[PDB]
């Protein structure tokens, strides 16, 4: 028995299987930032900090003695609750195949958006810095019309080539930019093919961020340390509802500051 306390919930095995399948299917679609960064294997719930390797000077305990203190990055935990109806839970054993899992889908969407925002733009409250605020290249503004994106992509590629960064290049775009690209010309495919023609990678859709960016997936530039992966826990229940939650714990680090180019939203 662990902290999740799953056995105390009045939920059948088939309902648990269906809920797990739905949650996994939703997370695999709404988890975007995990595909472009290095992800380590889970290390357990006892992980608290990751050493950076740097030190800071200290005054000194006694005369003739000098002291330094190591620097670390902390681990942060996220939890999102939701509620499920007991009638829908019980109908699974009766033979239902269309039970309502919309609150679970919404919770998965929220946790995925939170993780993506934390990775891409940082979490100042927890002391975690993002990739875009630490990027050292010159940001480029996106054009108003969808027909002028390839020249900006080419400018970003030129910046990367001048800086000297190799690897397959991937373009991450926000919802507004993705819709602007898709809803133009003959369905947006000629623009899509132009972008995939300049860059060997694939355009990635990220709903939780604004603007966009271009990065490389050569490896060794972004590290994500995961203590506990996304899991389901049990809080309480009433005569008609059961409250559950999703939880995870991780930390993130961006090593190379010249491997990405920031794309600001159009004016």
């Amino acid at each position: 028995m662990n902290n999740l306390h799953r056995e105390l919930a009045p939920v059948s095995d088939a309902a648990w299987e269906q809920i797990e399948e739905e949650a996994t299917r939703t997370l695999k679609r709404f988890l975007a930032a995990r595909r472009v960064v290095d992800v380590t294997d889970p290390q357990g719930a006892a992980l608290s900090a990751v050493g950076t390797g740097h030190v800071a000077y200290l005054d000194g305990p006694c005369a003739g003695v000098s002291a330094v203190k190591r620097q670390v990055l902390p681990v942060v935990e996220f939890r999102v609750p939701f509620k499920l109806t007991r009638q829908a839970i019980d109908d699974v054993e009766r033979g239902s195949q269309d039970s309502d899992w919309s609150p679970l889908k919404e919770a998965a969407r929220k946790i995925a958006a939170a993780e993506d925002q934390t990775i891409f733009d940082g979490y100042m409250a927890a002391g975690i810095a993002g990739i875009r605020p630490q990027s050292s290249n010159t940001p480029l503004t996106l054009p108003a019309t969808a027909s002028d994106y390839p020249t900006v992509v080419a400018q970003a590629l030129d910046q990367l080539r001048v800086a000297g960064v190799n690897g397959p290049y991937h373009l991450v775009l926000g919802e507004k930019a993705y819709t602007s690209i898709t809803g133009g010309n003959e369905g947006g495919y000629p623009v899509f093919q132009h972008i995939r023609r300049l860059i060997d990678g694939e355009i990635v859709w990220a709903p939780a961020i604004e603007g966009g960016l271009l990065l490389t997936t050569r490896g060794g530039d972004f590290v994500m340390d995961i203590g506990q992966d996304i899991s389901i826990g049990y809080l309480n229940h009433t005569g008609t509802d059961v409250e559950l939650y999703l939880q995870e714990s991780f930390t993130f680090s961006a090593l190379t500051s010249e491997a990405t180019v920031t794309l600001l939203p159009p004016e």
């Binding site: 999740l4 797990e20 899991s231």
Partner: peptide, 10 residues
Amino acid sequence: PGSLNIGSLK
């Protein structure tokens, strides 16, 4: 228990 294995989505 309840891991919900996702890992890397590469």
